[PDB]
């Protein structure tokens, strides 16, 4: 019955910032509220129990408080290790229910991507389907534009992009753009290029190869 509404859904903050996450229960939960920290690919980790009690070993910069039916998790000074998705959870009554989560990502200085293009191997050409991979490495912010050019002409139909999570060290992102073509289509053109525009680049950078060379 009790529904937890967590706010906000996502956040971007710098190291040293003060961040507060709020969670609202649709009914009275009598301080029975837990906060969890979930790293990408990992199980959630309890941080706070009974609304304000810290789990053993949790840094003191984490704290929880209550004002009526509103519950807040506060990080006094955000640190690099604190990137994660945070969840509230009531256990006043069954069924136990969670908030939707709050993503937390760390702000850093602009960083230009290093760009690489990968020609398809002959083994791949032999398969009847070819993938051309363009790599954007260690950049920030996340927003980037990758253009595929074939014999100088822009191609916009056959590509998909994939982005990593923020790196735990340098807080950068990486991105792959993969252009998929049939082997016949691939063998009917010479120059394959990806053109990337990013806020860290003074001018657009394009990487290319010549098929069969």
């Amino acid at each position: 019955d009790i529904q937890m509404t967590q706010s906000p859904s996502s956040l971007s903050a710098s190291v040293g910032d003060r961040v507060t996450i709020t969670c609202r229960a649709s009914q009275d939960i009598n301080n029975y509220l837990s906060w969890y920290q979930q790293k990408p690919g990992k199980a959630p980790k309890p941080l706070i129990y009974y609304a304000s009690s810290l789990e053993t070993g949790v840094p003191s910069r984490f704290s929880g408080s209550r004002s009526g039916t509103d519950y807040t998790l506060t990080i006094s000074s955000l640190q690099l290790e604190d990137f994660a998705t945070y969840y509230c959870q009531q256990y006043n009554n069954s069924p136990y229910s969670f908030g939707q989560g709050t993503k937390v990502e760390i702000k850093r200085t602009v960083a230009a991507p290093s760009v690489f293009i990968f020609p398809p191997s002959e083994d791949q050409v032999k398969s009847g389907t070819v993938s051309v991979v363009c790599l954007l490495n260690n950049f920030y912010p996340r927003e980037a534009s990758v253009k595929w050019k074939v014999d100088g002409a822009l191609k916009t139909g056959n590509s998909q992009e994939s982005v990593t999570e923020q790196d735990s060290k340098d807080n950068t992102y990486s991105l792959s753009s993969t252009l998929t073509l049939s082997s016949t289509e691939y063998q009917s053109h010479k120059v394959y290029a990806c053109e990337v525009t990013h806020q860290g680049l003074s001018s657009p950078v394009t990487k290319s190869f010549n098929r069969g060379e």
Partner: protein, 212 residues
């Protein structure tokens, strides 16, 4: 320092029964409380059910109560989850957890379960080969279901490695690339091998990445 470990099929056909087991090390399931929790990919957490080790009583989420069953084996210190009539809405990472009161104090590592009628398929692996820094890669294509694990040089090469999240292609199969950046001066001295493991098909692929 109790440890919990989920195990079960990573692929279940719709309408069948998903069965998972949680093996508990270091604690007796005869005390305290134990739960199942699930998390659909890219979504939040949902509590499934709990049993009381002391009295054997169970409690289930009303959104699943009719389809869910929990049994225990104190002899093996294991407990199980049975979820019948599964559909694609039941695709998720399932976790087991220990509770003292209401909080989930210890968690398993989680097991991804995909509900689909599509058959298991091992991956094809193709090398990605090309200044001061060079990039190498491996394209892991046309497998089902998730997950695959990729390492480089048997796991001894980790610095600069990026393994991207898989994308479901229009063919209904997954594809991803793993890349690593290395000094160009290393290209003539060091060999680079990507190691691919796909447990659902019991497939393992090692691919030497060479410059032609």
């Amino acid at each position: 320092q109790v440890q919990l470990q989920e195990s079960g099929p990573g692929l279940v056909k719709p309408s069948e029964t998903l069965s998972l087991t949680c093996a508990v090390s270091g604690d007796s399931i005869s005390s305290n409380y134990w739960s199942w929790i699930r998390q659909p990919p890219g979504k939040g957490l949902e509590w499934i059910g709990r049993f009381s080790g002391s009295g054997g009583s169970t409690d289930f989420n009303p959104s699943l109560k009719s389809r869910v069953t929990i049994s225990t084996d104190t002899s093996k210190n294991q407990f199980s989850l049975n979820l019948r009539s599964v559909t694609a809405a039941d695709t998720a990472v399932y976790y087991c957890a220990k509770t003292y009161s209401g909080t989930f104090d210890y968690w398993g590592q989680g097991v991804l379960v995909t509900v689909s009628s599509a058959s298991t398929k091992g991956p094809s692996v193709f090398p990605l080969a090309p200044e001061s820094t060079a990039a190498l890669g491996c394209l892991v294509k046309d497998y089902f279901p998730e997950p695959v694990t990729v390492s480089w040089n048997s796991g001894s090469l980790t610095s600069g490695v990026h393994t991207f999240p898989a994308v479901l292609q229009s063919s209904g199969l997954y594809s991803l690339s793993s890349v690593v950046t290395v000094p160009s001066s290393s290209l003539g001295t060091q060999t680079y091998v990507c190691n691919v493991n796909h447990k659902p098909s019991n497939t393992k692929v090692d691919k030497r990445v060479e410059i032609k």
